[PDB]
């Protein structure tokens, strides 16, 4: 259960806030403790859960989640499809 | 933290070239739907 607001901004009312500043009780290195810590999320990555304005990551009811290693790359590099022998 | 202004993600293409290349697809399309035909372009109908 995130507790989110809008990002520090002075935009016209028409322009909706797409960057929600969310604070949440996160886990610690030790099972014993916890930690309230904040992060920023896009409006599409969260859903209003329900006078607090509290949200959740949208995957929480559809699927589980796994953080891609930053030590990886998404760049599309050229592949060749080679045949076996006698093909 | 976001360092600096809060702006909007976007993409730019040349209106000139898009005009040019959308003209090419139309020249080709009329080979399948008739020489005396209107072929306009519209945005997505709806979905995910």
């Amino acid at each position, epitope marked *: 259960t995130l507790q989110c607001t809008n990002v520090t901004n002075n935009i016209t009312d028409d322009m909706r806030g797409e960057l929600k500043n969310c604070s949440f009780n996160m886990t610690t290195e030790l099972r014993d403790k916890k930690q309230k810590v904040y992060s920023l999320f896009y409006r599409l990555d969260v859903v209003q859960i329900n006078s607090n304005k509290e949200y959740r990551l949208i995957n929480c009811n559809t699927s589980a989640i796994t953080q891609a290693c930053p030590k990886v790359s998404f760049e599309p590099i050229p592949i060749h499809y080679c045949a076996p022998a006698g093909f | 933290d976001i360092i600096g202004d809060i702006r*909007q993600a976007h993409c730019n293409v040349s209106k000139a070239t898009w005009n040019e290349t959308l003209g090419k697809v139309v020249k080709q399309l009329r080979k399948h739907f008739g020489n005396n035909t209107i072929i306009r372009f519209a945005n997505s109908s709806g979905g995910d």
Partner: antibody
Framework: QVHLQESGPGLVKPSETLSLTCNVSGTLVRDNYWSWIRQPLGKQPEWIGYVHDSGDTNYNPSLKSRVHLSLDKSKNLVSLRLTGVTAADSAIYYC??????????????????????????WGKGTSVTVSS | APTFVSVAPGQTARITCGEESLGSRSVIWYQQRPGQAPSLIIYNNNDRPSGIPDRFSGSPGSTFGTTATLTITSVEAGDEADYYCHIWDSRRPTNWVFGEGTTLIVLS
């Protein structure tokens, strides 16, 4: 040639209607955008509000309802009306032409900019006391 | 609370005003000559109109996490006065009261 001169009563009782006027010279009211600034004793100045023809007349939110700016086309002088006057309102008031501008940091169509005005020419001043 | 800046004649003084920067800003600067009215000295972050010569340098609005500075160069007796700044941050709302003053006082 262009020059300004403010005037007022000089003294107001608590909870009354403050009223001020500013003589103009050289250029006229329709041509430019007008603004007021008050400055209490030994403190930084507080921007009161701005005024122009066509309804471009938004005010200081901290002053809220009690302030009403206005104009006088024929007589060619800037006007001001403040209600519910108190000790906090004791200051030397100023009239000034405000000059607008545009500061752009992103795409204009995305509306990623803001309107910023400064006030280039002031008057002499308007000493306004408020005591019973 | 009342802040002061002091330098020798012919030197270059430096004066800061207002909150630390968030987004790109336009900052207006003024000079209250004791007795007289506030005088607009800089309108853009470093633009000066007629009547005010160089160099009244200033912080450009292009920086973030930075303070707003006003650099007086080659100071003289006349330059002694109170100063104020007006801030316009793309992120923060309209500042309806000039930032706190910073009074300059040359030496000797």
């Amino acid at each position: 040639q262009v020059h300004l001169q403010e005037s007022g009563p000089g003294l107001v009782k608590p909870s009354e209607t403050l009223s001020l006027t500013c003589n103009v010279s050289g250029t006229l009211v329709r041509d430019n955008y007008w603004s007021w600034i008050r400055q209490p004793l030994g403190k930084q100045p507080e921007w009161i509000g701005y005024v122009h023809d066509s309804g471009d007349t938004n005010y200081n939110p901290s002053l809220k309802s009690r302030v009403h700016l206005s104009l006088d086309k024929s007589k060619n002088l800037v006007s001001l009306r403040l209600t519910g006057v108190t000790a906090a309102d004791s200051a030397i008031y100023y009239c000034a032409t405000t000059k607008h501008g545009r500061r752009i940091y992103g795409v204009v169509a995305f509306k990623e900019w803001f309107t910023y005005f400064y006030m280039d020419v002031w008057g002499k001043g308007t000493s306004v006391t408020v005591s019973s | 609370a009342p802040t002061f800046v002091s330098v020798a004649p012919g030197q270059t003084a430096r004066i800061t005003c207002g909150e630390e920067s968030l987004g790109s800003r336009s900052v207006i600067w003024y000079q209250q000559r004791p007795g007289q009215a506030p005088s607009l000295i800089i309108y853009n972050n470093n633009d000066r109109p007629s009547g005010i010569p160089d160099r009244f340098s200033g912080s450009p609005g292009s920086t973030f996490g930075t303070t707003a500075t006003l650099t007086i160069t080659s100071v003289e007796a006349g330059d002694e006065a109170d100063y104020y700044c007006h801030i316009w941050d793309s992120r923060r709302p309209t500042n309806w009261v000039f930032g706190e003053g910073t009074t300059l006082i040359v030496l000797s």
